[PDB]
């Protein structure tokens, strides 16, 4: 056993969404071993927060039309799925949005909770055309992982059935795109030994370094069973 462990070298954060992470030195073949196994956990298993429920006033269903609003309610729900939200303390927060007058309703119009950060405040949700028009809604953000559709969520719970509650497809996973590469390491005299560049392209909330840390933790927790129980 010539155990040679890699170490986190450099995190080239080009943007808050897109960041490269270089990794060296890796012994031959471990570059692709961790590369893919991590990519899989980073795609599907990464916990995140996502808009689960919405409840707009003057709205009985998502297919209706609201006066003084360019977008149909479905297109508003779409914008709320891609609303970047980070809940710090609790798993479930129900934010309130009341806004009026002529203006594109941005994410900053939502009343921020003590422990809730709206990561992109300039994110568009709805367009108010008429000055007389006012919009009011209650946006529930819950935490989960992966992607939970509204068609899978309308066939499980349904204990309380309040008429006026629109469910939304949850985009819980924060990682949008991920693709690991391999480059020259140029260490001491290892030569063969190289590195592993993990390029991540995420939303706002989950931080590149933090996310890779969590993904390696999930893989190590699955490996407990193969180390401990034989």
């Amino acid at each position: 056993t010539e155990f040679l462990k890699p170490r986190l070298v450099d995190i080239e954060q080009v943007s808050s969404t897109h960041a490269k992470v270089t990794l060296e030195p890796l012994e031959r073949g471990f570059g692709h071993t961790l590369g893919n196994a991590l990519r899989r956990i980073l795609l599907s298993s990464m916990p995140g927060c996502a808009v689960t429920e919405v409840e707009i006033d003057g709205v009985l269903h998502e297919y209706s039309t609201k006066e003084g609003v360019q977008e149909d309610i479905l297109e508003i729900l779409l914008n709320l799925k891609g609303l970047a939200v980070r809940v710090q303390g609790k798993d479930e927060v129900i934010l309130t949005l009341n806004k009026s007058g002529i203006g594109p309703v941005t994410a900053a119009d939502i009343t921020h909770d003590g422990d809730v950060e709206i990561v992109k405040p300039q994110h568009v949700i709805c367009h108010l055309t008429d000055e007389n028009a006012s919009i009011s809604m209650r946006i529930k953000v819950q935490r989960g992982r992966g992607y939970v559709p509204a068609s899978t969520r309308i066939h499980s719970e349904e204990d309380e059935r309040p008429i006026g509650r629109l469910l939304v497809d949850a985009c819980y996973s924060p990682v949008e795109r991920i693709a690991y590469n391999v480059e020259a390491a140029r260490v001491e005299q290892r030569t063969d030994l190289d590195k592993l560049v993990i390029e991540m392209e995420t939303n706002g909330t989950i931080d590149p370094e933090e996310a890779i840390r969590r993904a390696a933790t999930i893989l190590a927790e699955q490996l407990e069973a193969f180390v401990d129980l034989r």
Partner: protein, 50 residues
């Protein structure tokens, strides 16, 4: 015979599933067989899945 009628309108939102028929525009038919997870799909060197 008819005294009154109530017409109800439902809205189903059906998503794609195995069995649904798809095609292009050159007569190339097909049936979805499996929705493969994003983790499993092919991806180019850039990293973007098919």
């Amino acid at each position: 015979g008819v005294l009154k009628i109530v017409k109800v309108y439902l809205a189903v939102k059906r998503r794609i599933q195995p069995g649904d028929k798809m095609a292009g525009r050159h007569g190339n038919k097909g049936v979805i067989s499996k929705i493969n997870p994003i983790e499993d799909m092919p991806y180019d060197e850039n990293g973007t899945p098919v």
